[PDB]
Amino acid sequence: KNSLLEKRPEDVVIVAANRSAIGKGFKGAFKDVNTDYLLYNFLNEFIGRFPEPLRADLNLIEEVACGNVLNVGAGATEHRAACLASGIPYSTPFVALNRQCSSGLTAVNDIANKIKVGQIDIGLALGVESMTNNYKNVNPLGMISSEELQKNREAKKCLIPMGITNENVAANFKISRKDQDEFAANSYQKAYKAKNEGLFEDEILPIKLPDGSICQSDEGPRPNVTAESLSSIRPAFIGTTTAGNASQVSDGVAGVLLARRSVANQLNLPVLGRYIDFQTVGVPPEIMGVGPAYAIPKVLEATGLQVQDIDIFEINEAFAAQALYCIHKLGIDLNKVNPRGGAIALGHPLGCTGARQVATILRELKKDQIGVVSMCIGTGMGAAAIFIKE
Amino acid sequence: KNSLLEKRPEDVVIVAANRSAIGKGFKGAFKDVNTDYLLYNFLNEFIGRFPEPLRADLNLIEEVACGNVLNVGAGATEHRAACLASGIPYSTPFVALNRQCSSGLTAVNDIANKIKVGQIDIGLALGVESMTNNYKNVNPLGMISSEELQKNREAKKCLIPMGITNENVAANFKISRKDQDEFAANSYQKAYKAKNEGLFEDEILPIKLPDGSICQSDEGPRPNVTAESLSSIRPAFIKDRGTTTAGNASQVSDGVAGVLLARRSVANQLNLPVLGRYIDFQTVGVPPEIMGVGPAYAIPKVLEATGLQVQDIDIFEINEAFAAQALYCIHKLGIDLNKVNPRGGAIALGHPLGCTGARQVATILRELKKDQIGVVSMCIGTGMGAAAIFIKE
Numbered sequence: 012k013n014s015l016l017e018k019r020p021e022d023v024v025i026v027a028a029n030r031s032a033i034g035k036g037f038k039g040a041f042k043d044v045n046t047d048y049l050l051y052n053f054l055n056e057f058i059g060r061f062p063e064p065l066r067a068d069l070n071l072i073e074e075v076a077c078g079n080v081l082n083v084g085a086g087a088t089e090h091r092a093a094c095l096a097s098g099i100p101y102s103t104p105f106v107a108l109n110r111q112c113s114s115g116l117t118a119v120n121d122i123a124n125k126i127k128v129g130q131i132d133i134g135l136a137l138g139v140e141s142m143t144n145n146y147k148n149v150n151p152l153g154m155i156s157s158e159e160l161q162k163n164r165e166a167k168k169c170l171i172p173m174g175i176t177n178e179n180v181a182a183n184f185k186i187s188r189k190d191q192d193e194f195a196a197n198s199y200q201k202a203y204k205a206k207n208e209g210l211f212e213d214e215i216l217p218i219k220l221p222d223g224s225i226c227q228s229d230e231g232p233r234p235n236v237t238a239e240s241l242s243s244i245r246p247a248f249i250g251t252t253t254a255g256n257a258s259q260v261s262d263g264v265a266g267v268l269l270a271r272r273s274v275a276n277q278l279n280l281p282v283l284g285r286y287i288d289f290q291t292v293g294v295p296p297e298i299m300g301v302g303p304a305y306a307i308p309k310v311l312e313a314t315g316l317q318v319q320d321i322d323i324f325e326i327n328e329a330f331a332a333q334a335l336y337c338i339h340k341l342g343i344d345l346n347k348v349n350p351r352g353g354a355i356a357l358g359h360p361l362g363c364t365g366a367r368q369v370a371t372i373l374r375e376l377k378k379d380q381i382g383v384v385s386m387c388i389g390t391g392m393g394a395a396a397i398f399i400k401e
Numbered sequence: 402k403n404s405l406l407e408k409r410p411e412d413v414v415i416v417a418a419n420r421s422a423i424g425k426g427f428k429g430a431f432k433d434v435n436t437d438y439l440l441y442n443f444l445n446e447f448i449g450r451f452p453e454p455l456r457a458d459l460n461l462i463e464e465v466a467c468g469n470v471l472n473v474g475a476g477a478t479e480h481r482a483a484c485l486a487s488g489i490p491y492s493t494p495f496v497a498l499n500r501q502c503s504s505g506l507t508a509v510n511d512i513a514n515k516i517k518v519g520q521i522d523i524g525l526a527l528g529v530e531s532m533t534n535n536y537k538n539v540n541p542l543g544m545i546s547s548e549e550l551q552k553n554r555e556a557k558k559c560l561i562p563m564g565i566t567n568e569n570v571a572a573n574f575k576i577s578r579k580d581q582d583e584f585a586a587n588s589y590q591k592a593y594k595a596k597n598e599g600l601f602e603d604e605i606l607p608i609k610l611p612d613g614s615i616c617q618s619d620e621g622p623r624p625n626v627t628a629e630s631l632s633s634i635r636p637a638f639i640k641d642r643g644t645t646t647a648g649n650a651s652q653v654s655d656g657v658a659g660v661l662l663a664r665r666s667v668a669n670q671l672n673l674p675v676l677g678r679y680i681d682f683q684t685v686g687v688p689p690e691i692m693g694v695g696p697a698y699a700i701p702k703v704l705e706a707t708g709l710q711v712q713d714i715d716i717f718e719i720n721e722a723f724a725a726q727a728l729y730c731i732h733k734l735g736i737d738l739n740k741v742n743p744r745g746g747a748i749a750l751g752h753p754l755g756c757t758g759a760r761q762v763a764t765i766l767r768e769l770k771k772d773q774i775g776v777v778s779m780c781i782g783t784g785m786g787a788a789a790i791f792i793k794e
Contacts, residue, residue: 045546051556074684083538085475087499089545091783092559095689096550102686104785106507109477110496117496124514130683144546148473155479156435156534158611160486166441168491169482221549290520291464293492296485390481392494 012320015287015399016379020273023123024282024401026065026133028267029057030370031218032211032229033358036142036260040226041218046082046141047089049218049264053139054097056216057266064278065133065268069098071278072268073131075105076121078114078138080361081145085109090139099135109362110291112329113386113394114138115265116365120289120396122269132274138366139264146260168296169390173329174248174257176389180300181251181332188251191331192241195256195355198328202232202352210351214370231259231358256331261358265366282401284373287381288314289396291388300333302393303385304340310395316381318343321397323375325368327386328353337387351375369398376400402713405680405792406772410666413513414675414794416455416523419447419606420658420763422619423751426533430616431608431655436472436531437479439608443529443657444487446606451661454671455523459488461671462661463521465495466511468504468528469755471535475499480529489525499755502722503684503779503787504528505658506758510682510789512662523663528759531655558689559783563722564638566782567645570693571725578644581724582631585649585748588721592622592745600744604763608657621652621751649724654751658759675794676766680774681707682789687780693726695786696778697733703776703788711736713774718765720757720779721746730780743768762791769793 031053034040041049058066065071075094079086087107094105110117115138122134153161153170160166171179180186205211206229217227241255275282290309294302303326311317324347328334338348351371354364368384376382378400385395421443424431431439448456455461465484469476477497484495500507505528512524543551543560550556561569571581595601596619607617636643637650668675683702687694696719704710717740721727727748731741744764747757758779765775771793778788 047545047550048547051547051550080474080477083473083544084470085477085497085499087470087475087501088559088783089550092545092550092553092556095555095559096553100686101555101688101784104684104686104787105500105783107475107499108496109474109499110494111477120520121511124518124520128514128517130510130514154473154476155437155482157438157441160437160441160479160482163482163486165485165491166482169478169485291494293490293494295491390478390495391491 015314022272023126023269023286024272024275025284026268026270026275026280026282027061028283028370028373029216030214030265030367031263032215032226033231033261033263033360034226035230036262039230041262042143045144046086046139047093049141050090050139051093051096052218053216053264054094058097062280070100070102071133072099072103072135074122074125074134075099075103076108076118076136078108078118078362078365079140080109080111080114081148083148111389112361113365113388114362115367116384116394116396118366119267119369123286126269126271133270135266135268136366137266138363140360140362141262142260142360143262171297172248173389174252176297176299177252177330177332178249179298180336184336186332186335189238190335191251191256192238194331194335196236196238196241198353198355199232199236201350202356203234205351206232213374229357232352232356252330258329258354258359261360263360263363263367265363265370267366267369284398284400287397287399291392291394294391294393296391299389299391300329300387301336302387303337303395306393306395307341307383307385310397314397320381321383322380323372323382324348325372325384327364328355329359329387331355333387372398373400402709405707412665413516413662413679414665414668415677416661416663416668416673416675417447417451418660418676418763418766419604420760421608421656422605422617423621423654423656423753425620426653426655429620429655431531432533435534436469436476436529437483439531439657440480440529441483441486442608443606444484447659448488452673460490460492461523462489462493462525464512464515464524465489465493466498466508466526468498468508468758469530470499470501470504471530471538473538501782502754503758503781504755505760506777506787506789508759509660509679509762513679516662516664522667525659525661526759527659528756529657530753530755532653532753533655561690562638563782564645564650566690566692567723567725568639568643569691570729571644573691574729576725576728580728581644581649582628584724584728586626586628586631588742588746588748589623589626591743592749595744596622603767619750622745622749645723649748651722651747651752654753656751656753656756656760658756658763660759660762677791677793680790680792684785684787686785689784692782692784693722693780694729695780696730696788699786699788700734700776700778703790707790714776715773716743716765716768716775717741718761718777720752721748722752722780724748726780765791766793
């Protein structure tokens, strides 16, 4: 702990971290634009809000890693194109990564390890998803081509709809609908509330739409949500899982600029916080929602921290059931989890979430406080990273 | 350099590294099978040959990073599903990466960095591509959606056909059709020899086809090719004035490749054999319009990072996207043709996109003798280059 708290020149620090507002998939803010447009417009704003010495030499950025789940090729061609257009020079390399729901956080881990091994000094981690425009790339009949794989016992599990996996968790550890709806309404309340106080204002960057409008306020949170109001809601997969209690389908983008500390100090770049560690573990795909239950304990153990050492937890709300289970299995103080609201209220744009949670967390922690970002991952995994506010 | 030759416990070593044969696209062995089926079959055999410790506890593998360029989502869902089918437990995580033509080597760098930072002790890097079955996913009109980005001066450079960026290189640096044809036949010459001498039988693992037959020999190196014979081919991208043709460019194909890496100390503790070690990897960006010059810049970057010099390299495996860019890099580097793609390049064996970077490691290993130093490098669509250094053990 105290040693974690010490600042070292080799630390991987966060210089800037921002997100666009999250538009509702299909009918929301970003429905008529794709990931290439989100990313370009987002970077234009992000780069503007970067520190002078950087805006003036984007060549100092040595790698761009961008998480994306639904585009062909995870969007590498169009995203590199968009970074090129925003002014990040051709000389800066680009890599697309897809680790499903955690892609945006996995991008932060990629740039952090590159800085740690000396491969680069400064790098950009991004996350972007347009579920509205790419939801369709996924063949409703599953993405496994082979007959035998399709009939293979293990392989087949990567075919269980995420919703059903959440039904397994609820059923399995007996998770009540009331429990789920209360969690959900609770989520809506804190989001709406934090949204109204402008708590997101620092983190959000506006994106003007082609047709001139401008999106800068999260679309999902509403005021007045309650457990019984959510109780009207029908089951969406089979069934305690309903639209009211699952993350909303959305569109968004987010980014985190990272550097070694001694380098940022040399360039005199402001440091908002630092990355401490990241770990991933696989879990049975049929109950993928329990990923954080195993990933959180892994990263705490690797860093020698305990739950009670964490001030804030940003555990993605893929669905109420899964979130509940993890909070509960680990013994986390409810009031510490997603205190400005979660994906149930805010929305879950697949590849963007991991980085988006990083932008969120930094405004929720005070100086010297420690936070964890974690999420379950389709196909059976969990990821968790720890950060310290500077 | 004698320093580099010194074996440290924290070194990232290569325990196993192999590839499937490379199928010609649309017409080849793998034509009716997808990346899921290839990776499954290939893992069934690569794992089959792992040391005793690992096969009995595949949980020792703490990460699988798989490079892929054309599948939706870079194939994460279906490749994780194939790893599962193969016996790698649900507990081992999986990540898909797309760094275009260098995806398979980028996957090596990813696993190496994780082991270097203590995040894992043993990881598997894969590279897989069924261009026959996913070529269809790329829209011929371009993958950039926004009209605004489509007319952007820098963004549109990501829509110039690879074959045309090659014409840009050939013309900008006056590299003759004859020269391109020179380099290419030779390349064809080497794979042939090497295919016949049995020199890939080592690295190659056989794939069982649904029909029951078994693919296990590389479909691309053509019998008795020769230069002037190539000279009869028509330009492929620019009518009657271009120099790139189907004879001097990589062949479209399908293939899968894997490299199991571990920290030296853990390999020693579990008694895993070491084929050689990874020393470093660097990537750089170059103008997308002439993306083929990538190795020319990335090679110098990794040599420098490791304190080596071109002269210190015994074998260079520089991907042959096209003869013109390949000739340019080798020459801009002053490298001796004799040390390049000794058993033949991509012009002859195929460039199954996502698989190549890993494929090349399986190849370069069998080509270096104990203690020799190798470099793996490639130009990358959308303007980049990557290069890594390996040491045979």
